Amino acid sequence: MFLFFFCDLFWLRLLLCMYYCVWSRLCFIVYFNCLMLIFDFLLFCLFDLYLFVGLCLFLLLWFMLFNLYSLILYYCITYLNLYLLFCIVFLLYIAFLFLFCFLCDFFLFNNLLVGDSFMDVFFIRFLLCFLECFSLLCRCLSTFLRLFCNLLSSHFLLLMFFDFFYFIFVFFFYGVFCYWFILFIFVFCFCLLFYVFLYLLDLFAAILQLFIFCNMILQLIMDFLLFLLFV
Amino acid sequence: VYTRWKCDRLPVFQLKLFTQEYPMHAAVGIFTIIFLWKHMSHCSEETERKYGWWAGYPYWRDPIARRNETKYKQMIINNDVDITHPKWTGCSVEQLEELSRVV
Amino acid sequence: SNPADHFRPNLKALTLYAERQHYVDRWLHVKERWLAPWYLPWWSPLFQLGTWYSQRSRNLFLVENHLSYRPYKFRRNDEDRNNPY
């Protein structure tokens, strides 16, 4: 089976072509932490710690073109599938993990064995190492699951509320002319307030979820970085 | 001065980007694509009927049946298949003629 | 149900079907055509890359002796749990 379809960004691709044929400065970045990894001067890293900037920026742009514009009614999030997000997070996370593993430095994993020599090695430290190795994969899974479920739930809620608003607005507006107009006016104002609140909440939540999605990958990278001090 | 992004053409820059900038990501992407097309590229007729149609499966015309019929007719005509062979029917040609005369 | 139906791609255009046997056979023919010429010795890394992994996978499949039953990959109906056939 081979299905031929198209993403829902064609108009946005046209706009990007129209507006970015000429250069322009970028100063606001959703995830700015990918550009400043070191805060204490004289610390430098021999590992390619800035390799994630390009992928981070492209992912932010793509996910913003999809999610933020999905608030507009009937707009489609073409990539919204659990296993597709699993594929994306697998690509990124496992790529960085295999970059660290291909380094062939086993000492890099010394920190996996949690605790000190005082703790029993077999009955405490080994169990902690097992749990942390499990927690890495769980972090990957959690990133992808959170990204999927936030969008799915928010859009379900928006659709349900819009259906209720349409129903009451269409089939109960005549009450404006009746003696119970005050009840309808109260309900209508309540609905407008909830509409605005839902839109604001979704707007903020999409950006925040993208921030956290990039933050998880940067955290994975940071968990294996070692900084040397200039002398 | 020479820079990959400014001086190289798009295909060359793409090869450079995915060979000397993000080679591990490209390798993992190809691995995942191969897995997807090796284990997630089939759909049975029942699955298509349940979920394969936007508004539902139109049983009143059974498009899957017509699709399979066209497929099989094309295969038979092009490959010169004798569908009356005993293996397809499980009985000899004379037995088939006897059955046709009976029914 | 109805709310769930709103999360589908909205620009589906065409669907093409192909049996695994047919396109696997066509790919094998292409590979044989490109790896046949004399100027590509069997001991070259390219030829081995082309052939060895496929041979190993097919051999693993042939040696398989499973006590359980694996239903046919391309059945007409695989949505029934109580009917592997």
Binding site: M1, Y79, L82, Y83, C87, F148 | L36 | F7, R8
Partner: peptide, 29 residues
């Protein structure tokens, strides 16, 4: 739910793979 489906997962993921391998270089340059 299609978001939970896998009967056409490969064709569905082709969109992301095209975006990553063919559109990222263009947005990059």
């Amino acid at each position: 739910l299609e978001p939970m489906s896998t009967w056409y997962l490969a064709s569905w993921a082709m969109v992301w793979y095209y975006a990553f391998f063919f559109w990222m270089p263009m947005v990059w340059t």
